[PDB]
Amino acid sequence: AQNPNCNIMIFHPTKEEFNDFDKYIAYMESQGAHRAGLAKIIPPKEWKARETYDNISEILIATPLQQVASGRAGVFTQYHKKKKAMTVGEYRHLANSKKYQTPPHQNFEDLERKYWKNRIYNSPIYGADISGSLFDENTKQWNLGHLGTIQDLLEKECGVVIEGVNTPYLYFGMWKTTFAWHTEDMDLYSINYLHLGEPKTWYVVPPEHGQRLERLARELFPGSSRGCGAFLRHKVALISPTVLKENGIPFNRITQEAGEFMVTFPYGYHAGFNHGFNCAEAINFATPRWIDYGKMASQCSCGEARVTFSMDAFVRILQPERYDLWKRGQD
Ligand SMILES: O=C(O)CNC(=O)C(=O)O
Ligand SMILES: [Mg+2]
Ligand code: NI
Numbered sequence: 300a301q302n303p304n305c306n307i308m309i310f311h312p313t314k315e316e317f318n319d320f321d322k323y324i325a326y327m328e329s330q331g332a333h334r335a336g337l338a339k340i341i342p343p344k345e346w347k348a349r350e351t352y353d354n355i356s357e358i359l360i361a362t363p364l365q366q367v368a369s370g371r372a373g374v375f376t377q378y379h380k381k382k383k384a385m386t387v388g389e390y391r392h393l394a395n396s397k398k399y400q401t402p403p404h405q406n407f408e409d410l411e412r413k414y415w416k417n418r419i420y421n422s423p424i425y426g427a428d429i430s431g432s433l434f435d436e437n438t439k440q441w442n443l444g445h446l447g448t449i450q451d452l453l454e455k456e457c458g459v460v461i462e463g464v465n466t467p468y469l470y471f472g473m474w475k476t477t478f479a480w481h482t483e484d485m486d487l488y489s490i491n492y493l494h495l496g497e498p499k500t501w502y503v504v505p506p507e508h509g510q511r512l513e514r515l516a517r518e519l520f521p522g523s524s525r526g527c528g529a530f531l532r533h534k535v536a537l538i539s540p541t542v543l544k545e546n547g548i549p550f551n552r553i554t555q556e557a558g559e560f561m562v563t564f565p566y567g568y569h570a571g572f573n574h575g576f577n578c579a580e581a582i583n584f585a586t587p588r589w590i591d592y593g594k595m596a597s598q599c600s601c602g603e604a605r606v607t608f609s610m611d612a613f614v615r616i617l618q619p620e621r622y623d624l625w626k627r628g629q630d
């Protein structure tokens with residue numbers, strides 16, 4: 300079995316190897332990359348996502364989210380308070396303000412210590428989930444706006460044509476902005492490209508050990524657990540590396556820098572934070588290996604998790620028994 304300790308793998312494809320996206324994913328899996336839940340891909344040195352980032356300031360963040368925490372430093376929830384619209388240029392100035400900017404630090408490890416010690420005492424503002432793309436249309440390799448769609452994968456594997464579309468999303472972050480512990484909708488893959496700015500630190504649990512994280516989360520968030528049988532789908536809960544280590548949960552960590560891709564694999568729980576002002580682009584995708592994970596994915600039916608139009612068809616075709624109750628949650 301390749302990668303039996305489920306370490307995060309880092310890949311350096313040549314420009315020749317960067318032509319065929321599906322084939323490279325399948326290569327990474329042949330080497331065991333999926334067992335970690337997360338992989339890093341450093342693009343060939345010849346490749347670029349676009350020529351410059353000089354003209355992005357007039358992108359609108361229609362609903363910036365202030366991430367307010369409750370709990371203790373290593374075990375907390377966050378809720379998202381909606382703020383007034385602002386442009387990317389306005390958001391960048393805010394991120395660089397004395398109130399919100401990254402503190403002085405020695406290295407990524409010292410910054411990580413400061414994040415876990417102090418996150419709960421501040422409410423950073425995240426420009427998340429903005430439909431759009433920063434890839435130049437002439438970028439032909441690993442362009443997240445040009446990938447094969449999950450609806451077309453389901454049709455190719457299963458023979459059933461379904462409605463729905465699959466487009467990317469932009470994330471504009473600042474110091475302390477936080478992504479809570481989750482897997483993707485329908486336990487899909489994700490791919491994330493850090494276009495610009497400061498790094499993003501990731502934590503991940505190997506897919507084969509995901510249920511250990513779920514059982515800890517039920518213990519640590521006991522009211523949330525009684526409210527919903529899949530409450531990590533709400534994307535609100537944080538658990539620190541120190542707490543995970545104290546409870547014996549297997550995980551790994553890695554920092555992504557500008558210019559690098561990360562891939563999350565089906566049923567790979569992940570969480571993380573931004574080091575400063577940055578912009579990332581991400582999308583879900585599928586391969587033939589995903590289909591069995593899609594059939595088994597948990598679902599929120601309490602009504603909190605409220606997801607896309609396109610997830611309807613996935614539930615309807617892959618999980619017909621759940622269909623009914625899940626759509627009651629979505630309506
Ligand atoms: O970058 C973020 O805030 C969150 N991204 C992801 O969870 C992802 O790409 O799967
Ligand atoms: Mg602009
Ligand atoms: Ni994710």
Ligand SMILES: [Zn+2]
Nearest residue numbers: 527599601603
């Ligand atoms: Zn729920």
